[PDB]
């Protein structure tokens, strides 16, 4: 017979009061009246490696990758794991930022010649589909705050941090003999023509300028481990040069159709079919990336979006910002439970692509340079948000490689 309370009114207990209905109250003898230190390298690399295999799970599963990728990842993460555990110091000196996760994913994908490119990764992670923006997301482990900072920090890929970290890894363990670091070029061309509404001739145009300056040899290292660089090496991440050739091609090609194959108008109609904000999975995505792109204008771009864009936005917020990070509690379960928590419309990708291909289907004088310019600058915008680089970065590259074509042409 228990209630614990009221100890015992006898100073050789206090032993433990139950009340009988008769009010004696009776006591038993029988009166009736934290985190690791300095080798959490091991835990660090475990949350990191665990987060990696988690992401692989999401891309074979949800992206229908091949199972071979995983082995290619154990090999690359194995090489650099072996290289950081061929390093002595108790001072950690490692940077396993998230850019390293994405860095070995892209590295492995590129060995395997899969037609995935950096912009696929940027989209995937900025749309909260592929889990990224957290340490062991809200649900795990308590580590030294020095390493939680080594994770949460350097999170952004958005100034070319991804290209720089994939080249950095490409030094950390060598691309050349160990792997095949040729990019999947021609699928990028397809991705690009379809990404505009360019007629399929430009695939072969740009493919040809490509062959003209390179003869199609494309590497992955830009490495001489440092920070320091100041010439020759704004433009040797293959992709960025591909986009540069693409832009150039459009400019040259269209401004020297002495044939007049490409109407003064169809460049405008192309610009407008490219400009018309319409709600497909893709453009909705590019809006989602526009939101976390560092520079204006792209945030003024979210300004010029429309009620349905904002709505599908809050949708993606309640879906993929459940991937958040980090008495009164039940008072907030009832408090929030005070207000209720609670023929397919928009079209697919090739549907939109088809319909603007038709919106220009009427195919069959110095201010047309204007049309060339505004088209080039819109295309540029899309590339800047999609491939997470800078205005100034891009134009540095296409400037350099444009002089790199004039030099091998003159």
């Amino acid at each position: 017979t228990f209630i614990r309370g009221p100890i015992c009114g006898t100073d050789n207990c206090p032993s433990r009061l139950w009340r009988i209905i008769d009010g004696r109250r009776t006591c038993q003898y029988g009166h009736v009246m934290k985190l690791i230190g300095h080798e959490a390298k091991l835990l660090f690399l475990k949350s990191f490696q665990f987060i990696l295999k988690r992401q692989i799970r999401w891309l074979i599963t949800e992206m229908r990758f091949p199972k071979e990728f995983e082995h290619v990842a154990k090999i690359i993460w194995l090489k650099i794991l072996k290289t950081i555990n061929d390093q002595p110091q108790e001072e950690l000196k490692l940077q396993l930022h998230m850019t390293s996760t994405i860095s070995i994913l892209y590295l492995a994908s590129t060995h395997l010649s899969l037609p995935v490119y950096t912009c696929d990764y940027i989209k995937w992670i900025c749309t909260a589909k592929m889990p990224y923006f957290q340490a062991s997301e809200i649900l795990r482990i308590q580590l030294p705050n020095y390493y939680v900072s080594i994770l949460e920090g350097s999170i952004s890929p958005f100034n070319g941090q991804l290209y720089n970290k994939i080249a950095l890894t490409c030094g950390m363990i060598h691309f050349k003999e160990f792997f095949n670091s040729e990019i999947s070029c021609q699928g990028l061309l397809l991705k690009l023509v379809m990404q505009c509404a360019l007629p399929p001739e430009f695939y072969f145009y740009t493919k040809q300028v490509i062959e003209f300056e390179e003869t199609d040899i494309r590497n992955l290292t830009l490495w001489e481990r440092t920070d320091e660089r100041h010439t020759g090496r704004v433009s040797n991440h293959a992709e960025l040069r591909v986009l540069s050739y693409f832009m150039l091609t459009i400019n040259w090609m269209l401004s020297f159709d002495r044939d007049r194959q490409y109407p003064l108008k169809w460049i405008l109609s192309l610009t407008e079919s490219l400009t018309q904000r319409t709600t497909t999975s893709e453009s909705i995505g590019r809006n989602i990336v526009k939101v976390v792109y560092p520079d204006k204008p792209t945030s003024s771009d979210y300004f010029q979006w429309s009620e349905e864009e904002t709505l599908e936005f809050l949708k993606w917020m309640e879906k993929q910002f459940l991937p958040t990070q980090t008495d009164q509690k039940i008072a907030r379960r009832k408090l929030y439970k005070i207000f209720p928590l609670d023929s397919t419309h928009q079209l697919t990708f090739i549907e939109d692509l088809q319909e603007r291909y038709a919106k220009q289907t009427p195919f069959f004088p110095p201010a047309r340079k204007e049309a060339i310019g505004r088209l080039l600058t819109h295309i540029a915008s899309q590339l800047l948000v999609d491939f997470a680089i800078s205005k100034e970065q891009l134009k540095d590259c296409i400037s350099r490689i444009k002089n790199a074509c004039l030099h091998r042409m003159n």
Binding site: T310, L314, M317, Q325, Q328, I338, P340, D342
Partner: protein, 303 residues
């Protein structure tokens, strides 16, 4: 380009606040000389003020009789010369960008880039867009959508928001579902009236001395929910309930409940009642009709 409803991303802004208020201390200290630790920052930021119904201000009378120039070039650079080197010491500890900011604000130049404009996180940026769409939809009369925004928002763990007037007028104009503006307000007072800075001007406040906007507005607006009638002894029952004595505005709410209930000796007691609370409302910072007008309605009653 609009205010964000999140606590500002931290480190550099705080250590800049350090450099700023520390140098401020050294200059103003030597200035009073010539006129003769989190806590150091705390005292430092501390000793400083922290025909229609216009809640009028305090106009100009009973104030000083000027000053004549204190500060020539030579005299100012006298005051400035030494505290700038003292600053040279911990400037060596802060970051290069922070040091540059110290150099420029101390020249008097004002920084190009906002705290937001240089801020740098997924979940919080998403909450920013969520809350934004809430405020936008509530402005757009889109009470349905806005309601979806609100429910999805309050679901989130991430930030508490003072944003409360946003939700007061929000659920107010919403009418849609969720335990409404009054419920929110009385919640605000029940949670934040007991021991149980940057962000805070007056339109969101703490219950030591006046929590103003939301309280007085649910008060009056509830008396207008009696304008729906001709509920009152309810509104002044829970205006009777709270102790937060620096109001008087709830004294005029009270006396207004008695004038509204006075529209037989019972009606007499209500008129003597309003007569009382108008003076115990002369208790504090006055809400005044000529009030002989109030009494003139009370004589139209005395009929």
């Amino acid at each position: 380009m609009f205010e964000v409803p999140i606590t500002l991303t931290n480190r550099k802004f705080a250590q800049r606040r350090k450099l700023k208020y520390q140098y401020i201390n050294y200059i103003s200290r030597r200035f009073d000389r010539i006129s003769k630790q989190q806590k150091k920052r705390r005292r430092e930021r501390h000793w400083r003020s922290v025909s229609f119904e216009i809640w009028r201000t305090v106009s100009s009378q009973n104030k000083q009789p000027i000053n004549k120039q204190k500060m020539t070039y030579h005299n100012f650079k006298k005051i400035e010369k030494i505290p700038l080197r003292k600053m040279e010491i911990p400037l060596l500890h802060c970051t290069k960008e922070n040091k540059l900011y110290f150099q420029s604000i101390s020249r008097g130049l004002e920084p190009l880039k906002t705290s937001t404009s240089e801020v740098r996180n997924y979940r919080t940026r998403h909450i920013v867009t969520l809350t934004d769409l809430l405020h936008l939809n509530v402005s757009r009369h889109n009470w349905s959508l806005a309601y979806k925004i609100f429910a999805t928002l309050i679901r989130i763990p991430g930030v508490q928001i003072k944003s409360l007037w946003g939700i007061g007028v929000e659920i107010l104009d919403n009418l849609s579902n969720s335990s409404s503006g009054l419920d929110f307000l009385q919640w605000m007072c029940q949670i934040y009236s007991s021991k149980s800075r940057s962000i805070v001007p007056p339109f969101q406040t703490g219950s030591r001395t006046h929590t103003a906007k939301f309280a007085i507005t649910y008060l009056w607006s509830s008396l207008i929910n009696c304008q729906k009638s001709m509920l009152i002894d309810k509104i002044s029952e829970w205006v009777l309930t709270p102790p937060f004595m620096e109001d008087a505005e709830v004294w005029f709410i009270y006396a207004s409940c008695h004038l509204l209930k006075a529209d037989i000796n019972q009606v007499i007691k209500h008129i003597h009642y309003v007569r009382t609370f108008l003076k115990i409302c002369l208790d504090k910072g006055g809400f005044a009709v000529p009030s002989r007008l109030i009494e003139n309605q009370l004589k139209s009653f005395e009929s």
